[PDB]
Amino acid sequence: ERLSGNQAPSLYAISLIVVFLCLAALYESWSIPFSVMLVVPLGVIGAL
């Protein structure tokens, strides 16, 4: 239990890096992925 909750923050970090780079390698623009990595806090707040 203190291994799940201790590595969780690093799961959220490397999962946001991958979805950022997969987005920039598809829609070209560096500003595109930044348009949508701002939408992640809008959906996390309803989850919790």
C-alpha–C-alpha distance, residues 46 and 10, integer Å: 21
Q: Are 12 and 18 in contact (CB under 8 A)?
A: no
Nearer to ligand PTY, 2 or 46 (CB): 2
| Closest of 3, 32, 33 to residue 19, by C-alpha | 33
Q: How many residues bind ligand PTY (CB under 6 A)?
A: 6
* Site map (CB under 6 A) of ligand PTY, residues 9-48, x = contact: --x--x---x---x--xx----------------------
Nearer to ligand PTY, 14 or 45 (CB): 14
